[PDB]
């Protein structure tokens, strides 16, 4: 059958899910405007709950399969609060970047051109897709996040950060060991390099990255041997 030219999902797939929003849901521009008036009565981050992520045609999509980085537009919806009653938003974005943020729990966050959103609970329709978050891309975000904030980090510091990071339960991920990192060494170093080559001291040069780059060149078993 025919595919969506945005996300590649089959239109006639019985598992295909569309985004839903309550009738009073508004635009990101509408939401941010209303908000300006409320603080008049500056630019904080938002909590976003009962959230969904989708392509421009409304197909529910993964955050982490490369769509964003390929410059395919991902839109999102949910109930937003600036930062424990929210405002219903729909077709927010697109997402320019997703990232990790923190009590030792690493939460998914989105940047649009206008605002930042910390993701709380998925909508029940989105939950199984959010649940398919991969270990390697989440680990990558943790790595990138940890090295931005700690430019002098050693490999031991990194493994510690990884081992103690609890994924939120919506991600449906096991706790991480040193093996979680080692098994994805190559993917991780590609992600760190990609981050460095994209914007603006590079995290690729951090002492612990030197170690990871080297471990990326050895068989998985031999990486483990060095654990």
Ligand X SMILES: OC[C@H]1O[C@@H](O)[C@H](O)[C@@H](O)[C@@H]1O
Q: From CA 154, how far away is CA 145, in angstroms rounded? A: 14
Report the residue from 9, 20, 88, 101 that binds ligand X according to the rule CB under 6 A. Answer: 101
Number of residues that bind Zn ion (CB under 5 A): 6
Q: Answer with the entry of Zn ion, ligand X, Na ion, none that 101 interacts with (C-beta below 5 to 8 A by kind).
A: ligand X
Report the residue from 73, 116, 121, 157 that binds ligand X according to the rule CB under 6 A. Answer: 116
Q: Answer with the entry of ligand X, Zn ion, Na ion, none that 133 interacts with (C-beta below 5 to 8 A by kind).
A: Na ion
Q: From CA 3, how far away is CA 103, in angstroms rounded? A: 42
Pairing mode, if any, of strands 75-82 and 46-54?
Answer: antiparallel
Question: What is the nearest approach in angstroms of Zn ion to the Cβ of residue 57?
Answer: 5
Other C-beta atoms closer than 10 Å to the C-beta of 221 total: 8
Phi, psi angle pair for 199, to nearest 5°? -130, -140
7 is in an annotated binding site: yes
Q: Answer with the entry of ligand X, Na ion, Zn ion, none that 111 interacts with (C-beta below 5 to 8 A by kind).
A: ligand X
Q: From CA 209, how far away is CA 142, in angstroms rounded? A: 13
137 contacts 107 by C-beta, under 8 angstroms: no
User: Does residue 4 interact with Zn ion by CB under 5 A?
Assistant: yes
184 is in an annotated binding site: no
Report the residue from 49, 65, 99, 186 that binds ligand X according to the rule CB under 6 A. Answer: 99
């Amino acid at each position: 059958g025919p595919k969506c030219i945005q996300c590649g999902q089959y239109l006639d797939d019985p598992d295909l899910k569309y985004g839903q929003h309550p009738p009073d849901a508004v635009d990101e521009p509408q939401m941010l405007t209303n908000e300006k008036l409320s603080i008049f009565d500056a630019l904080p981050q938002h909590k976003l709950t009962c959230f969904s992520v989708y392509c421009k045609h409304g197909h529910l999509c993964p955050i982490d399969t490369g769509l964003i980085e390929k410059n395919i537009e991902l839109f999102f919806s949910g109930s937003a609060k600036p930062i424990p009653g929210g405002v219903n938003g729909k077709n927010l974005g697109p997402i320019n970047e997703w990232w990790i943020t923190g009590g030792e729990k690493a939460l998914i966050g989105f940047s649009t051109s206008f605002a930042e959103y910390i993701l709380m609970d998925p909508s029940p329709e989105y939950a199984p897709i959010f649940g398919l978050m991969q270990e390697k891309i989440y680990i990558s975000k943790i790595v990138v996040e940890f090295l931005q904030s700690n430019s002098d980090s050693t490999y031991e510091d990194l493994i510690n950060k990884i081992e103690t990071t609890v994924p939120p339960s919506g991600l449906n991920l096991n706790r991480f060991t040193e093996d979680s990192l080692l098994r994805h060494a190559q993917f991780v170093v590609e992600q760190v390099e990609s981050y460095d080559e994209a914007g603006d001291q590079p995290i690729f040069l951090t002492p612990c990255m030197r170690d990871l780059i080297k471990l990326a060149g050895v068989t998985l078993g031999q990486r483990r041997a060095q654990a």
